[PDB]
């Protein structure tokens, strides 16, 4: 299954497929083929098995040696050991977030259900690069600090440039946790020092305490239909949710409720929403059958919902509770909030436009990323430490946790501040 969710976030032009296939062995993929124009801009999924020969390096199935195929310029070979079967240490899960700035709201959502991260830095561009800081800050807000910085694209980048970049990032982030996070330079054109990464992810990132006894909550981020185009009438199936569970052991045959709900017909107001109920058909993770779905892992829960809800990606950031979950489904919400004194996620060589942003004005639409949900809503009352927001589609608030608040600076939204629900 899975034990931890390590995320693979990283700004434009570092190469995703080479690094993702080295760590998991499962390709990051989704629509267009044209696998991506540059680096993956979709929310990729992948799981993997991490075993040892009693060595800090992680074998392949063929554990005698491993000859890469990253480049035919030279032969990159590494040796994990010699063969006689290897001991399974754990089953790991990844969360490949978008690597592009416009997709920030999606990157936030996907990130918010991980248990650790890997900041994929690229040495090609600017030294205190916008997105590195954006990522790091969001991570410390959500409730994580289990980060391993990875210098992913320094294959042709000289050692002065690459040294200056790690220095400037680590010096800018002087108020964000990063001093207890290692910085592992690797090759992505010769897959070198990959074996030492395997030692790091088992060290810096154990399994955090998971609450089995507590009531099941599944947060769905990806939508999958298994009926698909060309289905037969008596080959009928349910609709499958790619979600991570962050609380409770969800068992097979259990009934689960999707709690933001669907709005009642001919509503004259903003209420009323009614949750949808679906019975769990199957609990699939990796490529191995399971009867349980332990928390701390990203699992494909097939449920008895019908094709229309899974025919496109429409279940992004929905909260699912088993069953008749107590969590309130607000339509208008009381945010406590604070703002950054800089504009996060933007800053170029001329140092534009990380200038301090003006105060929020009422009746402006802002993206409130609450939980893994992403709703848009307008601010109806605006006091400094008390704003009232009215949301277009209702938000199930599992706990008052955190929020991330963004404002439409130009073409798309950009992160301005965070806070906590009251």
């Amino acid at each position: 299954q899975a034990t931890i969710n390590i995320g693979t976030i990283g700004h434009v032009a570092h190469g995703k497929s080479t690094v993702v296939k080295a760590i998991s062995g499962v390709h990051t993929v989704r629509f267009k083929n044209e696998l991506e124009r540059n680096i993956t801009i979709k929310l990729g999924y992948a799981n993997a098995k991490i075993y040892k020969l009693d060595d800090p390096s992680c074998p392949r199935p063929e554990c005698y040696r491993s000859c890469g195929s990253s480049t035919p310029d030279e032969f990159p070979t590494d040796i994990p050991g010699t063969k006689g079967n290897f001991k399974l240490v754990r089953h790991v899960s990844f969360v490949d977030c978008p690597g592009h700035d416009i997709l920030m709201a999606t990157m936030l959502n996907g990130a918010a259900v991980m248990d650790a991260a890997l900041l994929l830095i690229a040495g090609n561009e600017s030294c205190p690069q916008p997105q590195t800081s954006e990522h790091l800050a969001a991570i410390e807000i959500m409730k994580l600090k289990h980060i391993l910085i990875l210098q992913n694209k320094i294959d042709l980048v000289k050692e002065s440039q690459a040294k200056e970049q790690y220095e400037q990032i680590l010096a800018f982030v002087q108020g964000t946790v990063a001093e207890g996070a290692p910085i592992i330079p690797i090759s992505a054109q010769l897959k070198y020092n990959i074996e030492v990464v395997c030692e790091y992810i088992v060290k810096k990132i154990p399994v955090p305490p998971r609450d089995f006894t507590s009531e099941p909550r599944l947060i769905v981020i990806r939508s999958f239909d298994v009926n698909k185009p060309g289905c037969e009438v008596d080959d009928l199936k349910g609709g499958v949710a790619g979600g991570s569970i962050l609380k409770g052991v969800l068992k097979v045959g259990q009934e689960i409720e999707v709690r933001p709900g669907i709005v009642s017909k001919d509503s004259e107001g903003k209420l009323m929403c009614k949750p949808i109920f679906s019975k769990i058909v199957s609990l699939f993770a990796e490529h191995n059958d399971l009867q349980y779905a332990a928390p701390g892992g990203l699992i494909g829960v097939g449920t008895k919902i019908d094709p229309t809800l899974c025919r496109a990606d429409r279940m992004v950031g929905q909260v699912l509770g088993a069953v008749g979950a107590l969590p309130e489904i607000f339509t208008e919400l009381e945010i406590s909030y604070f703002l950054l004194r800089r504009l996060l996620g933007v800053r170029t060589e001329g140092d534009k436009k990380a200038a301090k942003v003006q105060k929020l004005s009422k009746n402006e639409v802002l993206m409130v990323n609450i939980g893994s949900l992403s709703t848009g809503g307008r601010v109806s009352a605006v006091k400094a430490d008390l704003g009232k927001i009215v949301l277009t589609n209702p938000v199930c608030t599992e706990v008052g946790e955190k929020i991330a608040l963004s404002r439409r600076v130009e073409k798309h939204w950009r992160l301005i501040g965070w806070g906590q629900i009251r």
């Binding site: 698909k228 185009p229 289905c231 009438v233 019908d306 229309t308 809800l309």
Partner: protein, 266 residues
């Protein structure tokens, strides 16, 4: 020979002429509508315009839609015009001619089961097949009977047609080869575009209901080609049988979905 009971055309009868060769005045063409009887086109009237062109890569084996001005049954000369044409429009005549040719081929054998082709005593053969059809009245009526016969299987060997030589061995599997049919296949597209979570269930229920109806009657089959999009494809040989299937399919969509409530487009 020819399918028609009469041996000659009449004034202002639209015919199709095979241009055999160009010589002097114009061309000594053969009317193919009535056997292979000789006629002629130009000298005075045929052209409608002059542009100093009439062929380039238009070779031979071709054919003109013409109308009969003067016909001489005794003398065997038929003065023809193409300039007269307006409701006698060439495309429609050509379409009619092709259909007539296949009908002629059916009526001129007929003939255990080689077929043969040719030749047999000629007046008798034509009289018992094609002349009798023309008699059985009139030309519209013959066309209708012929069409019914053509349809393979509507119903298969029947009408009367008590005729003659034996004659069912030929009717059974010469005629299908002779014609050929082609084909007819028609898609029927249905999109049921629900987006409640009750509506989807309603569509699914409707599809199941549809299957039950299909089994009950015996014909097709609806197939899901995308989550809201459904295709049945209906073949028709009796023509109007596809209408009956379409009506049933529509009714399932309209009544069954309604029960648990949904929306549809068809």
């Amino acid at each position: 020979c020819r399918f028609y009971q009469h041996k000659f055309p009449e004034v202002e009868d639209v015919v199709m002429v095979n241009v055999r060769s160009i010589a002097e005045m114009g061309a000594y063409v053969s009317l193919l509508e009535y056997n292979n009887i000789e006629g002629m086109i130009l000298l005075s009237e045929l052209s409608r315009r002059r542009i100093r062109s009439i062929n380039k890569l238009i070779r031979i084996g071709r054919n003109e839609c013409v109308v009969v001005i003067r016909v001489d049954k005794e003398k065997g000369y038929i003065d023809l015009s193409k300039r007269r044409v307006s409701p006698e429009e060439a495309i429609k005549c050509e379409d009619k001619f092709t259909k007539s040719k296949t009908v002629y081929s059916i009526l001129r054998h007929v003939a255990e089961v080689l077929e043969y082709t040719k030749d047999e005593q000629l007046e008798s053969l034509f009289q018992r097949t094609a002349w009798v059809f023309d008699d059985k009245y009139k030309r519209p009526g013959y066309g209708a009977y012929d069409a019914f016969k053509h349809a393979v299987s509507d119903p298969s060997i029947l009408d009367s047609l008590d005729l003659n030589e034996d004659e069912r061995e030929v009717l059974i599997n010469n005629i299908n080869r002779r014609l050929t049919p082609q084909a007819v296949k028609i898609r029927a597209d249905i999109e049921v575009a629900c987006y409640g979570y009750e509506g989807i269930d309603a569509v699914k229920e409707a599809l199941r209901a549809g299957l039950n109806c299909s089994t009950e009657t015996m014909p097709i089959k609806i197939n899901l080609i995308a989550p809201p999009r459904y295709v049945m494809t209906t073949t028709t040989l009796e023509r109007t049988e596809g209408l009956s299937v379409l009506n049933q399919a529509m009714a399932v969509i309209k009544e069954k979905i309604e029960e648990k409530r949904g929306v549809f487009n068809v």
